[PDB]
From Swiss-Prot:
Domain of life: Eukaryota
Protein name, UniProt field: V-type proton ATPase subunit a, vacuolar isoform
Residue ranges, Cytoplasmic side: 61-74, 173-190, 275-337, 423-458
Parent-record interval covered: 383 to 840 of 840
UniProt PTM comment: Glycosylated.
Amino acid sequence: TNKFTAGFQSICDCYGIAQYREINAGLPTIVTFPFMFAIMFGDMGHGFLMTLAALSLVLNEKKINKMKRGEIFDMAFTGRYIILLMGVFSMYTGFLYNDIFSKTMTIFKSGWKWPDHWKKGESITATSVGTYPIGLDWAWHGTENALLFSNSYKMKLSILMGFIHMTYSYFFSLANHLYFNSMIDIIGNFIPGLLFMQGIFGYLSVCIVYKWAVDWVKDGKPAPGLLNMLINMFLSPGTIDDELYPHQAKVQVFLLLMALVCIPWLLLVKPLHFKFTHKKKSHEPLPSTEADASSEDLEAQQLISAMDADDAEEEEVGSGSHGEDFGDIMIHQVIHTIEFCLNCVSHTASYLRLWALSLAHAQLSSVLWTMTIQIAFGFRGFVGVFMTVALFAMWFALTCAVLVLMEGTSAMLHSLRLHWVESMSKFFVGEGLPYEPFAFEYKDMEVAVASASSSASS
């Protein structure tokens, strides 16, 4: 039966998108993968530069006139429409952190030339400015007046954003891998899945939030969040006690709870195994009840008896059709789930990359800024040499951009891949599908778009 149209079938493979909430299924991606480009930040005006690019792309939208056909054209039309979106998204966090690119300006190295003047009078201009008060936020992560704990600002920033990204990624496509829009009611993986991921991303972000919710000088509990959670892995004394104040021993019961939210994504998938061979149970997670011949069988079956639990659990086979032997899902799940949950570890190491990418990007541009400026200010006692030499600086800023874009692409790609595993890891199975965003026509990252949607929604 030519059910899901194959042109469409391979599409539910191309962006790795949920073939039943599909019209929207690539779309979070098509926004947020661009928002990831912005995770590649800036430091001069950059973001501004993403606007500058965005300009030629707008003109391109009107009508390319020099040659409407072309090599760079395929990279630049639709190839540029996605890029316009990017030049803009990256304009935007390139503008939100242009707040700090245009008014960081690096020199106080445990400062920012111009902080976004911190609360603690950080910019004590009475003292020597060079060593501005070195941080002052260390029961915190970032400082307007700290470039080393700017490394902490962005580091933990992106880390947090990471928890948001991963969670959001688990969730948009948690709900899009909510087999309902898709496969009516998968209980087997949706719920006990929510729980595990809720434990990693959640409790730890409850932690980053709590870090971002107690200036722990009155209350202690460490400012490397790792210094609060990688004590968690033995922290509890094996006595049930609770919080009196932010995660004291909300974490002590977090352990007992943590075993509870990992174990049923493995254990509840035992029921997937059990469930599939006899169809009625399988049905409670899946759309599968749709046949007419099935209804005759069901009508007889109801009259004659009634004992169903997930089919091995029904007492029939699902253990007699398990994890390896027979009864495929029952095979499958142990392969998949056992990997998948632990590739939620890899989803954990996913964001870290995102963190890194950005940490690094930001530093890079920071350096680049150092070189441009490095070219300009000094001299020898020849003014004529100054008026002249500044041109090479601006050509250097010209080089910087090419490099920026280049790395930016790579990163964007990296972020693509961060979505490739991550977006998709929820969107068209636990990892998705390798028929890549695009892999054929130069826009199937873009293929998420409705006007092309080769899915109605399905």
